[PDB]
From a paper:
Our previous work has shown that the Stl repressor, an all-alpha helix protein, is a modular protein composed of an N-terminal domain with the characteristic helix-turn-helix (HTH) folding, which mediates DNA binding, followed by a middle and a C-terminal dimerization domain. Trimeric Duts show high sequence conservation at the residues that make up their active centers, which has been used to define five catalytic motifs (motifs I to V) that are the signature of this family of enzymes. For all these Dut-StlN-ter complexes, the Dut maintains its trimeric state and binds three independent Stl monomers, each of which uses predominantly its middle domain to interact with individual active centers of trimeric Dut.
Surprisingly, in the case of the hDut, the structure allows not only the trace of the main body of each Dut protomer but also the C-terminal motif V. This P-loop, unable to position over the active center occupied by the repressor, is projected toward the Stl and introduces its C-terminal end between the middle domain and the DBD of Stl. The Y116 side chain conformation in the hDut-StlN-ter is identical to that in the ϕ11Dut complex, although its placement is not restricted, because this Dut lacks motif VI. In the hDut-StlN-ter complex, all the Dut C-terminal tails are well ordered, showing a similar mechanism of Stl recognition and complex stabilization by introducing a conserved Phe from Dut motif V in the Stl interdomain hydrophobic pocket. However, C-terminal Dut tail binding is a consequence of the interaction of more than one residue, since the Stl repressor exploits residues from loop α4-α5 (G66, I67, and P68) and the helix α7 (Y98, S99, N102, K103, and N107) to interact with the main and side chains of different Dut motif V residues (D127, R130, G133, G134, and G136).
Residue numbers in the entry:
A (entry chain EEE): 10 to 153
B (entry chain AAA): 0 to 136
C (entry chain BBB): -3 to -2, 1 to 136
D (entry chain DDD): -1 to 136
E (entry chain CCC): 9 to 154
F (entry chain FFF): 8 to 155
């Protein structure tokens, strides 16, 4: 039942170092609205997540997938490590739009980001050190 | 472009039809009988010529019923705005059994797909885009 | 501020269409059900969503690149009229040698808002051949 | 000045896309390599070009009429997003009884600049049936 | 060769839609004269005038064409005979097609399917006005299934 | 592409063929008489972007200049450029046929290659391209495409 969108918005607003005032200027929601959204005093669905996504600078569907984790696990690993996710996703996103082997093989960028982070973790590799060109080779490997 | 002009090339043609003012395509009708065996194709003539409105091409597109019930599909499909010949529909029968077309059968739709006619420009290399790069924000 | 792509769930099995990037050609469509598609067979895969396309377009249910290139999956039909308010169905063709499994929540196609003219039909006795068709260079 | 389709060569093997006329739906795409497509098989055919589509369209990789009518060749996939800067590939399906030969320099498909919307998505509880989709004549 | 009977079709439907020669002349931009010469006979009627009469009457143009072809093919139109029963049945079929996936992904022709349902109902001594959309929908699904 | 393009010769020969001066082509292209002279002489490099503009300036589809360049890379000379009058006349028929005849539209592979095959057939048969009836070309064209 529960979405946890309130927590997701608060956490991502903080992750992107935005004041409620700034997110308000950008989204068109007042600070009172954003506070009630964040605190669970006002329901959040698809239509609010479209606005928040644009305001945060994070594709709306990622908030859907983070919400999906909470429901499927009790918490979101990705939200807990959003810094690692933002970094890997920037590489996955780039590979998808600039490499034919990815564009003609990829099934889902968010699931592939998660698969790659799990692979870096198991290999004891740090996502902020890895070479793009090496990420690309790991990516082609998980798709094949 | 408000006008789709057509002319009959034979007595066998049916005027294209559109039930609703906001249907995606005009219905195209076979002008002849054809038997498409399993896993074969045929070129079905309409015996109409068309003059598409300016800024579109004519896409010959599948009927949902023929696709979902009889495993029928449309290959080809691109009609250039300058094409004044007989509009042909390339039907693909991927079904297990023969597919019968009779004169006057509705076999496809014609969508006026709006398109650009861009000029071509070579550059030494294209930059990875601002959306095809960068982290969040 | 419209216009928009409106949709509604017909069941709890539906997934809200998703688009990874502001300029992706298509919104992602998700299966609401399990299906087994044997080799050289077809299936109508239900989304359990209904859509109201914006004005001046039809909805094209278009193939996923990876699904085609790796599993020989294609999309038949795929024309969705502005006035259609039923359950959005995807007609999948499996031209592969192996059966293709669809699970609830699998991405099986993309929805493109193809911009079109809705012209008036006019019968004429004969069209002329266009100038561009012939003439000589220059 | 005029809308530009920008491309760059990813190898010496690519051919610059061509258009016979100012109002052709599609630019001609050429194979950069030799392929042999068995009966009822597919292949990803590389052009070794990258493209920057103009704003407001996606690139549709569309079948050639001749190849369809005479050799039962079709095009799978075929959606190129505005942001795609990778090698443009053509997913060729050979549905014919005979194998289909691709040589480097062969015309295997056309690239159409399909005008689309990029709509915002809005969930509602239920769509009402349309005017044109309800009631009798009048 | 065979005449279209468009004048008679237009007249019969104009009267059925309870419009005057003047109201149709309002909506179409044909002179109250031109309209009469079209119904009275002799003045001819192209597919292009039939598009204008369709919009004028508030009836889909293509249905005039299919009525005209009942005459050319059979010398009579069951549709033009019991047009009020055809309007009712068409409204249910049109609704089904645009609002139900089973029909949208199965229908071949809305007109032929209206006819085939009226014929199944005439041969059940069931009156169209005496049943409802849900009744028509069950039957419609039955005849489209193979 | 390693092998040179020979675009300088192609533009000079086609500009002369169209009975244009450096100056008139200059007015149409936007290239100065200096630039055009330097293109024709083979001093400045010529790529697809210049050929798009030269195409529009000459009233010749740009891709034909590409095709003519390919004749040099493959043969060391251009039969098309050596007898362009004949090519222009036969291409006008092939083009008209492609856009007006459903048998050609639904079978044609390449208008350029088919113009060449048709000119070869007329030379064999000693028929003049300036004299042949369109309705006869069309029968020749369907025959040439019948092979495949």
């Amino acid at each position: 039942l529960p979405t946890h969108y309130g927590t997701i918005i608060k956490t991502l607003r903080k992750y992107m170092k935005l004041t409620q005032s700034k997110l308000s200027e950008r989204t068109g929601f007042s600070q009172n609205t954003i506070s009630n959204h964040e605190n669970g005093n006002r329901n959040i669905g698809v239509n609010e997540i479209e606005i928040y996504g644009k305001g945060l600078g994070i594709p709306s569907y990622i908030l859907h997938r983070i919400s999906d984790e909470f429901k499927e696990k009790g918490y979101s690993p990705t939200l807990n490590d959003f810094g690692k996710f933002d970094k890997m996703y920037s590489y996955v996103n780039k590979a998808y739009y600039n490499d034919g082997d990815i564009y003609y093989s990829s099934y889902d960028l968010y699931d592939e980001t998660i698969k790659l982070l799990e692979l870096l973790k198991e290999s004891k590799i740090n996502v902020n050190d890895i070479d793009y060109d090496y990420v690309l080779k790991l990516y082609k490997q998980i798709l094949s | 472009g408000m006008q789709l002009r057509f002319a009959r090339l034979s007595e066998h043609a049916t005027a294209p039809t559109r039930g609703s003012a906001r249907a995606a395509g005009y219905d195209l009708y076979s002008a002849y009988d054809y038997t498409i065996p399993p896993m074969e194709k045929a070129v079905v003539k309409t015996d109409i010529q068309i003059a598409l409105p300016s800024g579109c091409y004519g896409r010959v597109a599948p009927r949902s019923g023929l696709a979902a019930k009889h495993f029928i599909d449309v290959g080809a499909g691109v009609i250039d705005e300058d094409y004044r010949g007989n509009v042909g529909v390339v039907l693909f029968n991927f079904g297990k059994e023969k597919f019968e077309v009779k004169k006057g059968d509705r076999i496809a739709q014609l969508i006026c797909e709006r398109i650009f006619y861009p000029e071509i420009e070579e550059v030494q290399a294209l930059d990875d885009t601002e959306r095809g790069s960068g982290g969040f924000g």
